[PDB]
Amino acid sequence: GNDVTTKPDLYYLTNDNAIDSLALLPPPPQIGSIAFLNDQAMYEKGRLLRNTERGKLAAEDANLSSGGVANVFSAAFGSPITAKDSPELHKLLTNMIRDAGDLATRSAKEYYMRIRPFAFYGVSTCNTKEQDKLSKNGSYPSGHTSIGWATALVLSEINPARQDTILKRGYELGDSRVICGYHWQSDVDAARIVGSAIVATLHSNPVFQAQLQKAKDEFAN
Amino acid sequence: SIPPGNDVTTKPDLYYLTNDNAIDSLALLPPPPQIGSIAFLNDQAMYEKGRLLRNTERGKLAAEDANLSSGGVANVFSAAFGSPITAKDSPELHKLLTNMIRDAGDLATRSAKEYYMRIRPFAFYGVSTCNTKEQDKLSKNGSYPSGHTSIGWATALVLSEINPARQDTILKRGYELGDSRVICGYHWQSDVDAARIVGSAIVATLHSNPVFQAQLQKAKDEFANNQKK
Amino acid sequence: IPPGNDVTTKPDLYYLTNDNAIDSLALLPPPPQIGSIAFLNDQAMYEKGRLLRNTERGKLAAEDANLSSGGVANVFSAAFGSPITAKDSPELHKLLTNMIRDAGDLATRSAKEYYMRIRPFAFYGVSTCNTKEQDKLSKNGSYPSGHTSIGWATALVLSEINPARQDTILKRGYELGDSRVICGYHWQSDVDAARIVGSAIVATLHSNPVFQAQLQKAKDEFANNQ
């Protein structure tokens, strides 16, 4: 598939530099297991939240295309993350979006092809724009949640004064996917492990290293 | 903010970080599974699945992995890393990994361990683990999240940053350290699961610290020079 | 037994009388009750089959659930090793067509009528993977499954005739039951109990002379075509 050699505005890494998610992760819970009972309970708990303030935030979080995940950390980061206001940071975060969303997750997604909750239950997610495509995908692990958690780790390295609010925010992104029906709870749980892994790999990459330094200097100035 | 305890200002060979730089694990993590919940039925099932494994090869390795005091986590990555991790053979790397053990083991976990004081599985079931040597120490502790698994996973992330060629074996090894703690009954599965999150967070924090950054560079340089022998 | 047809009223479909039939209500345990852990498992297994309805296995499941009674014999041909049909094996086809209602009805009746368990598609208000047979069965008692009792009984008999492929026959019979779970007409526990009544009714048939005779005729037909 696509990697740094075919769309370099969205990947830093090659196909060999990528994590083998299929070898690292445990299999998802199978129907019949206690763990999958818990996935079902968590889907219902999330559903009852869709009609609250927390559900509205969940739907806004599931709107984000790739390019707007950076943006949604602004309140937690302490200042706006935009091509205009913090361009070197925005460029860094846009270039790692596909390493975490796609490369870290590809081998597992395609092997298990887990059905997503809205398809399992034959009902709509909490914003239906964002479904028609993802439906065909494998639910396990979440490429979303992997992106969001990796982003929060990088941002935490850049502004530790707010790590606790940055990190909670990243955690809440995964919860939003559960509330909205896009993923099972265990999809998000495994996505955060591959998120940490892909952050380490990025810290071994020279292009990433340079861009990260530029972003730290932007933040210091 | 974190309860009181040691940090870099009192044991600078075992921490890079101050109490103020530590993750608030109590705020970040969900509560442990509560008794009465489906999730705790699953923790009980995973305790049993691990118990039936104690008399196999995997149980052998699990028991060997639970011998390790802190300082020997370095050593157990050697096979996976591709070369020996020791004061003698790679002093800069060993120093890097030793200076951070209580950042991942203590600071990353403290507010949560002390807030929930979760009972460990062997204490819950009134029986011994598969290696009775480290037991007495731990019984009274909070199980959630696991400090040992936090150390192991943070170590794996750093080692992966240094030798990406063996990421896959290194991460596996790190992952499996947590499973060993489950197999012997030292921790519930959900303790290990949360330890890997706070472990990741603490590695991010460490990457913002000048002393860590510098020592990491020394270790990367040492590793590139040993690849030429 | 509750009342119904037997050898005296439809003799092309039964070998046994109502007095010869197993009392399935006396033999089987009650079905899993709503509130029970076992019924949690029935529900998980229903969902597990439902996700399979799209797979190739679910396609085999749906083709298996087309079969009315007449035509269950036939679906063993691949497994049995040669075609089982009025044309190619008339004695075997006769043997199996005459025992279809013994296993499908007599072995199951008292229990079916006492428990009147709701079938899964009715419980969930959703359609099966094969909407052709639905409307008629909905009202019956799900527990035990008459289809699975037929399939498992047939497999035991055919294994007796061609032991060389017993393992593949038994499996095929087993899978007939699983298909009923995949397609939504029975709970897992319905199929589990039907295989017990299937075994029982095969013992009964082995004590019936008309059956023994037809079985011998079929064993000879099969050795002569080998």
Q: How far apart are CA B183 and CA C140, in angstroms?
A: 48
Q: Active site includes A90?
A: no
Q: Are B200 and A196 in contact (CB under 8 A)?
A: yes
C220 touches A at CB < 8 Å: no
DSSP C29: P
Residue A221 C-alpha from the chain's centroid: 29
Does A have 3 or more CB contacts under 8 Å with B?
yes
How is residue C110 written in tokens? 């008292």
One-letter-per-residue 3-state SS of B11-80: CCCCCCCCCCCCCCHHHHCCCCCCCCCHHHHHHHHHHHHHHCCCCCHHHHHHHHHCCCCHHHHHHHCHHH
Overall size of chain B counted in residues:
229
Report yes or no: B18 at the A interface, CB cutoff 8 Å. Answer: no
Handedness of CA B157, B149, B141, B101 (dihedral sign): negative
CA torsion, points C11, C15, C17, C23, in degrees to nearest 10?
-130
Q: How far apart are CA B140 and CA B123, in angstroms?
A: 9
Residue C117's SS3 state is coil
DSSP secondary structure, B164-214, as one string = GGGHHHHHHHHHHHHHHHHHTTSS-HHHHHHHHHHHHHHHHHHTT-HHHHH
CA distances from B19 to A16, B10, B106, B110, C2 (A): 39, 11, 10, 10, 78
Q: Do chains C and A touch (3 or more CB pairs under 8 A)?
A: yes
Task: Note whether C121 and C134 are within 8 A (CB).
Answer: yes
Q: Which are the contacts of A204, defined by CB distance < 8 A and separation ≥ 6? A: A17, B160, B161, B162, B164
Question: Pick from A25, A4, A2: which is nearest to A13 by CA?
Answer: A4
CB A23 within 8 A of CB B168: yes
Pairs of CB atoms within 8 A across A/C: 16
Q: Identify the structural domains of chain A with CATH numbers, from first to last.
A: 29-220 (1.20.144.10)
Q: In this structure, what token pair is assigned to residue A163? A: 């790590």
d(CA C78, CA C73): 11
* Nearest CA distance, C43 vs chain A (angstrom): 9
Subunit contact B208:A160, Cβ cutoff 8 A = yes
Q: How far from C142 is each of A204, B13, C30, C124, CA to CA, in Å?
A: 61, 70, 12, 14
C194: closest CA among C22, C11, C40? C22
Chain C neighbors (3+ CB pairs < 8 Å): A
Region of A181 on the Ramachandran plot (φ > 0 left; ψ -120 to 50 alpha; else beta): left
> Cβ(A98)–Cβ(A10) under 8 Å?
yes
User: Are the beta carbons of B170 and B163 closer than 8 angstroms?
Assistant: yes
Query: Which of C156, C185, C191 is closest to C76 using CA atoms?
Result: C156
The token pair that represents A68 in the structure block: 């707007």
Pairwise CB contact (< 8 Å): A32 & C40? no
Q: Which of A207, A190, A192, A211 has its CA nearest to residue A153?
A: A192
- For residue B20, which amino acid is it? D
DSSP track, chain A: ---TTT-TTT-SS-TTTS--HHHHSPPPPPTTSHHHHHHHHHHHHHHHTTTSHHHHHHHHHHH--GGGHHHHTHHHHTS---TTTSHHHHHHHHHTHHIIIIITTHHHHHHH-PPPHHHHHT---SSTTTTTTGGGS--SS-HHHHHHHHHHHHHHHH-GGGHHHHHHHHHHHHHHHHHHTSS-HHHHHHHHHHHHHHHHHHHT-HHHHHHHHHHHHHHH-
Please check whether residue A120 touches C, CB under 8 A: yes
Please choose, from the candidates B203, B111, B98, the residue with its C-alpha nearest in 3D space to the C-alpha of residue B161.
B203
User: Two tokens at B168?
Assistant: 């896959």
A58 to A45, A81, A127, B96: CA distances (angstroms): 13, 20, 9, 40
- The whole-angstrom separation of Cα A116 and Cα A16 is 28
Q: Hey, are the CB atoms on B160 and A200 less than 8 Å from each other?
A: yes
What would you report as the CA-atom Rg of chain A, rounded to the nearest whole angstrom?
Answer: 17
Long-range contacts from A203-211, C-beta under 8 angstroms, 24+ separation: A203/B161, A203/B207, A204/A17, A204/B160, A204/B161, A204/B162, A204/B164, A205/A12, A205/A13, A205/A17, A207/A12, A208/A12, A208/A92, A208/A95, A208/A96, A211/A88, A211/A91, A211/A92, A211/A95
C-alpha distances (whole Å) from A160 to each of A153, A154, B205, B207 are: 10, 10, 7, 10
Q: For residue C154, give the amino acid letter.
A: T
CA-based nearest residue to C195, from C150, C147, C141, C149 = C149
Given a contact cutoff of 8 angstroms between Cβ atoms, the answer to whether B134 and B176 are in contact is: no
Angle (CA) C164 C169 C174, round 5° = 150
CB pairs A-B closer than 8 Å = 89
Under DSSP, is residue C2 helix (H, G, I), strand (E, B) or coil? coil
Using alpha carbons, list the distances in angstroms from residue A57 to A61, A69, A72, C13: 6, 14, 11, 65
* B116 closest CA partner among B146, B140, B138, B142: B142
Indicate the DSSP class of residue C39: H
At what angle are helices A163-180 and A53-63 packed, to 10 degrees?
90
Chain centre distance of CA B104: 7
Distance CA A138, CA B166 (A): 27
Chains C and B touch (3+ CB pairs under 8 A): no
B148 has catalytic annotation: yes
Chain C neighbors of A31, CB-CB under 8 A: 44-45, 47-48, 51
Q: Hey, is the C-beta of A32 within 8 angstroms of any chain C C-beta?
A: yes
* Nearest chain B CA: its distance from A161 CA (Å): 8
If we measure between CA atoms, which residue out of C225, C220, C201 comes closest to residue C98? C201
CA atoms within 13 A on the CB side of A121: 17
Indicate the Cα dihedral angle B57, B59, B62, B63, nearest 10°: -110
Q: How far apart (Å, rounded) are the C-alpha atoms in residues A145 and A198? A: 12
Of these residues, A47, A183, A189, A192, which one is catalytic? A183
Task: Give the N- to C-terminal CA distance of chain A in Å, as an integer.
Answer: 38
In chain C, residues with a C-beta closer than 8 Å to the C-beta of A115 are 51
DSSP H helical ranges for C99-187:
100-104, 109-115, 120-124, 134-137, 146-161, 166-183
Chain B residues whose CB is inside 8 A of the A148 CB are: none
Given the residues A144, A175, A189, A192, the one annotated as active site: A144
User: Which method resolved this structure?
Assistant: X-ray
Q: Are C130 and C88 in contact (CB under 8 A)?
A: no
Kindly state the tokens that stand for B57: 């090869």
Task: Kindly state whether B215 is in contact with chain A, defined as any CB-CB distance less than 8 angstroms.
Answer: no
Residues of C carrying an active site annotation: 147, 180, 186, 190
**Token digits for A77?**
């980061």
Question: Resolution, rounded to a tenth of an Å?
Answer: 2.7
Q: How many CB atoms lie within 10 A of CB C157?
A: 22
CA B219 to chain centre: 20
Query: Which of A32, A115, A120 has the CB atom closest to C45's CB atom?
Result: A32
Residue pair B19/B107 in contact (Cβ under 8 Å)? The answer is: yes
> Is C193 in contact with C28 (CB distance < 8 Å)?
yes
Give the count of beta carbons closer than 10 Å to the beta carbon of residue B36.
Answer: 8
Rounded Cα–Cα distance for residues A130 and C77 (Å): 48
Which residues of A are less than 8 Å from C45 in CB distance? 31-32
CA distance B165 to C21: 71
Contact yes or no for C25/C111 (Cβ under 8 A): yes
